[PDB]
């Protein structure tokens, strides 16, 4: 009856893996529009139609730092581009106009014969995640584009803590010893200011700036919330709404809070 259901029914195991159902290919775009670099990762065979999703690194950092995203994302069914900034040094604020023009040239490569995700995008749903000022830069894009159907910075950072008219559902991911967005004065006042959406804070126990980069040592329980959020939001996936909105209750998680999040 969903018309957005896509691959097998979910379990913990599967969403714990490195790597979901569906097998990923990738290529480099060829003429980046809006921003500096991007790769682009998508499923084969996910049986129809996926959601699009533009993860965007912080100050000084590029692609690696958020490219494991990409292929983890993408074989639950779901396209993503990865992308590199204009320049290392961009604000929040440009980096979410960067991160809408990543998107948009994925709809646009949806409608170009050549391109490999031809056919493979409903570019009606779409979700933004990224890293610091990444993520703070994907804050901005929720609030400027109700248009979008789901949101998961992690560590984020803006010269903003007041993100209340936010009505698109956003998981939180913070480190708990974050030194460079801390917690009290970054990700939990970001949280605690949005009261017209479903909501999720999940802090990383003993977790620095970088906790939920590439390379971390959680990335069974941060990629089975990244893809259940994704999937219950944007595929409005019920099958996924005990993995997305539950308490892991696991000696990784130092906080976690959810509101407007049933099971």
């Known amino acids: 009856t ?9 379990t913990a195991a599967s969403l714990e ?3 979901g159902p569906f097998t990923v290919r990738s290529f480099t775009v060829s003429r980046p ?4 670099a991007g790769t682009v990762y998508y499923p084969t065979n996910a049986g129809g139609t996926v959601g ?12 690696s730092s958020i490219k494991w995203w990409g292929p983890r994302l993408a074989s639950h069914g779901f396209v993503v581009i990865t992308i590199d900034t204009n320049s290392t040094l961009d604000q929040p604020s440009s980096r979410s106009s960067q991160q809408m023009a990543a998107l948009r040239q994925v709809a646009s490569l949806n409608g170009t014969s050549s391109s490999p995700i031809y056919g493979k995008v409903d570019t009606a749903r779409m979700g933004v995640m990224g890293w610091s000022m990444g993520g703070g830069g994907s804050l901005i894009s929720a609030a400027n584009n109700p248009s979008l159907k789901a949101a998961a910075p992690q560590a984020p950072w803006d010269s903003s803590t007041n993100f209340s008219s936010v009505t698109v559902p956003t998981l939180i991911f913070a480190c708990e010893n974050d030194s460079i967005a801390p917690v009290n004065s970054s990700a939990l006042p970001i949280y605690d200011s949005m009261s017209r959406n479903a ?9 620095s700036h970088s906790c939920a980069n590439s390379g971390n040592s959680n990335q069974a329980l941060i990629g089975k919330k990244g893809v259940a959020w994704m999937k219950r939001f944007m595929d409005n996936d019920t099958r ?9 209750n696991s000696t990784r998680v130092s906080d ?5 999040c049933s099971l």
């Open 2 to 10: 969903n018309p957005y259901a896509r691959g097998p029914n979910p």
């Open 17 to 19: 893996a490195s790597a």
């Open 33 to 36: 529009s809006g921003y500096g």
């Open 52 to 63: 699009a999703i533009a993860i965007v690194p912080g100050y000084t950092a590029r692609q």
């Open 199 to 207: 909501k999720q804070f999940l802090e990383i126990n003993g977790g």
């Open 240 to 248: 996924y709404s005990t993995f997305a909105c539950e308490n892991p």
């Open 256 to 260: 976690f809070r959810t509101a407007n």
